[PDB]
Every structure is written in C-alpha cells, then in structure tokens.
Swiss-Prot record:
Cofactor binding, note field: Binds 2 magnesium or manganese ions per subunit.
One GO term describing the cellular component: cytoplasm
Protein's name according to its UniProt entry: Biotin carboxylase
UniProt-annotated binding residues for Mn(2+) 2: 286, 288
Record: residues binding Mn(2+) 1: 274, 286
Domain ATP-grasp residues, every copy: 124-315
Length: 445
C-alpha cells in the first residue's frame, strides 16, 4: 500500500463522470472499483476498471442509491475511499456519514457541511455571515404596516417580488405595493397559509458560478468563474469560462468572498457557489458541495485537475496551490451532449449505430459512449460533454462549431443539432445572454 494513500477507490457513479474519475485514478496509480447496476455492465469505465461490482438491478433507487450495497462493495474489495461524483448520493449526508462510519474516506466535504449548505435557510444564513452577497429581502414575513413594507422595497430597490411562505407576484413600484401584498395574501391563503415575504426581483439575470477548492485545514482558493446561463427548463445546456464581461477585479471580488466563506464554514474539497448576476451585482443562490458537471471548462482555463485535487484533499494534503499561482488563460466552452427526445427533453434510449468523435487542438471529449453502445432508459439523458478551449472566446466557439460538425452519433436522437444552432446564434456570439434567452429562441416561453 503506497502509490497514493487512497490506493483503491470505489467510484459510486456511472456514465461520463465515473470514467472521468477512473482516469484521474489511473493517472495516480490508484486501483479502481466500479460499482454498477445490472444495466451498466457495458459502461466504458466499467470495462476499464480494475474490479467491477454489481450493486443491484437497473433502477437507480435499487442500485446507485443503494447505500448498503455501495459500502459493502467498498468492504469486500478492501477499498479505502469512495468518490460519489455528482448527482445520486454525492450531496446526501446520511451516505457520507455511513461511509465514514464504516471506516472509509468519503471524497467530499464533512457531513455537517453537506447538511449546512443542503438547507436553504442555513446556507443563506451562513453566507451572509461570511459576507457573501445574498438576495435582498424583507428578512422575515411581511407585516401589514405598508410604511415599512414600502421602505423595505425601497431599500431593496424595485422591482420586488411578493412570495408566499409555503409555496408570487411582481411589484414594480410602491404605488401598487399595498394592493399586491393583499392580492398575494389572498391567493396564498387559498393556495396554500397567509404569511408572505418580500424579495428583490432579479428579472433578467445571468447564471455565474465560482469554483473553489478548500483543504479543510484553513486553505481555500477560487478558480475563476463560469457562466451557465444557456438553459432549457432549468437544465444547463452550455457552459463557458471565464464569464464574458466579468473583469479581473470583479472576479477577484466575488472570488475572495467565496474563499472566505469556505474558511468560515470549514469547507473541505471541491465545491461551487452559484449566483444570479444582474446589473453588476452577485446574489448567492446555492452551493453545490461536490464536483460540478461542467468542471472541465475551469480545468482548461486554469490548468488545474479538479478531480485529482479532490483526491489529494481527501488524503489529508493541504492545498499546494496558492491563490496567486492561479492564472486564467484562454476561454473554454462546453456543450452537453444528450440522447434526448426533442418533444419531451427526456432520455432517448437506443443503440448507437455509428460514432465518430471530433479531434484537433483545444478539443476535449468526456464521454463513455462508443459505436455499438446502447443508451439505457433508467438514468439521465447526458451521454457526454464536448469542451473546446481557445486563446480567446471567439476561438473556442469557432472550435466548438468545427468539432460539433465532426461529431457523429447515429441510431439515437441527440441535441447535437441544437448545439450547432446555439453556437451560430448571434447573441451567444456577442456574449452575456441571460437565463431566459434559450427558451426564447426556441419558444418554450
């Protein structure tokens, strides 16, 4: 035992993220244990792992969410750590608590941190305390004294939105504040209760998120930001880094705030701070206490291997990277490739009859698919991620177009066509479109 302390690791996940993790492991000489459902015996990473363990039938609830089977998998193989990747049990405290209780290292933050940020009220509370900008509001249920309510809205700045404590109405001026509150009162009465609170209405915001790394020993750094505004039905479709328009100084401002937050909450490992960004102001929404799907975009513009850092941190090693050594270079754009139905956006199962991946400079392909592989119906629609890097934003986009053209995936329905359309969208090329843009372009409004 000694190529890395975490000499053998259980990859509690599937698809592209599991492969991504497997590779990071092989690089470090770490033995891999791929737990899988009976429907994923043909996953690329499973076929490449040192050991494979079936943890149950196709259904996620019976496999990838099966806590005892996953820990038993770690036990029978003498594994020492478990990487939950993203989704599934990655932000499930109970799982982390049992994993560690069984004597294994959970590659993620402390159980108490998952719970903290996992709760919206506790999270906001902690973020404000640490100095992270949050969504302005009445700080509690609104009374009937329209005078302070008008002052609250004023202080927060219109437009404001009235929300029911148990579930909403937009107010653009104090002239309609009173009526609006009463109107909202009624509905909720019904609708739900009578209590109502006020929040700042962020009408046309962008989705900007800050990547961080903390060793849980007092060291925390931020690795630039990512703009993940290209959304359809709240699902991310395109991601890029850095975020267009964000200056080095603003980046430094929001970055140091998140790093400080990590220190205050004793955060450990990789995490992400998602904010709504409008009129140059950041507003914290939530923090994902895990690795991000779109992490590659950050990896390519900073030259940092986020998965490997997660492993080193989980191995008790303090951060070896100082904030001043972190330099953003170039631009990276990510298109998510999904095997999805164009009318429901749901997974579109089937056999891939022909597959050809794009190649060339600045082209990264994260995917488990291969000619002959069949997309199962039990999980998500994501079959891969295509990330293109360039010395600047225009080069990255130009490369994504070229790469999307070389990409061949027959036998199943995909969104490749959609991606090409987005890369050719004049507004996207200009940069900085808000979270409502995509649904507009395609009329899902």
């Amino acid at each position: 035992r000694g190529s890395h302390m975490l000499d053998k690791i259980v990859i509690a996940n599937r698809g592209e993220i599991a492969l991504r993790i497997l590779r990071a492991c092989k690089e470090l000489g770490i033995k891999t244990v791929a737990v899988h459902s009976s429907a994923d015996r043909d996953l690329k990473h499973v076929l490449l792992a040192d050991e494979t363990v079936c943890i149950g039938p196709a259904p996620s609830v019976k496999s990838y969410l099966n806590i005892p089977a996953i820990i038993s998998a770690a036990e029978i193989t003498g594994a020492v750590a478990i990487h939950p990747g993203y989704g599934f049990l990655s932000e499930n405290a109970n799982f982390a608590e049992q994993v560690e209780r069984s004597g294994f290292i959970f590659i993620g933050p402390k159980a108490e941190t998952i719970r903290l940020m996992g709760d919206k009220v506790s999270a906001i509370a902690a973020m404000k305390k640490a100095g992270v900008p949050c969504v302005p509001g009445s700080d509690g249920p609104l009374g009937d004294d329209m005078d302070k309510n008008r002052a609250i809205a004023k202080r927060i700045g219109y437009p404001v939105i009235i929300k029911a404590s148990g579930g909403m109405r937009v107010v653009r001026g104090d002239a309609e504040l009173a009526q609006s509150i009463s109107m909202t009162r009624a509905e909720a009465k019904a609708a739900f209760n009578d209590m109502v609170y006020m929040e700042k209405y962020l009408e046309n915001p962008r989705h900007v998120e800050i990547q961080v790394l903390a060793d849980g020993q007092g060291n925390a750094i931020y690795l630039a930001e990512r703009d993940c505004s290209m959304q359809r039905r709240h699902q991310k479709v395109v991601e890029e880094a850095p975020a267009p328009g964000i200056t080095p100084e603003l980046r430094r401002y929001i970055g140091e705030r998140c790093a400080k937050a990590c220190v205050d909450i004793g955060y450990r490992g990789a995490g992400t701070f998602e904010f709504l960004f409008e009129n140059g102001e950041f507003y914290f929404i939530e923090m994902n206490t895990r690795i991000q799907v779109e992490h590659p975009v950050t990896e390519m513009i900073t030259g940092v291997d986020l998965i490997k850092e997660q492993l080193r941190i989980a191995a008790g090693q303090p951060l070896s990277i100082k904030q001043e050594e972190v330099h953003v270079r170039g631009h990276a754009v990510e298109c998510r490739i999904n095997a999805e139905d164009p009318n429901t956006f749901l997974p579109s199962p089937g056999k891939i009859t022909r597959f050809h991946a794009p190649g060339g400079a600045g082209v990264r392909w994260e995917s488990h698919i291969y000619a002959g592989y069949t997309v199962p119906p039990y999980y998500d629609s994501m079959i891969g991620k295509l990330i293109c890097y360039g010395e600047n934003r225009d080069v990255a986009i130009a490369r994504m177009k070229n790469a999307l053209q070389e990409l061949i995936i027959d036998g199943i329905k995909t969104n490749v066509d959609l991606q090409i359309r987005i890369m050719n969208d004049e507004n996207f090329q200009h940069g900085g479109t808000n979270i409502h843009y995509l649904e507009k372009k395609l009329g899902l409004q």
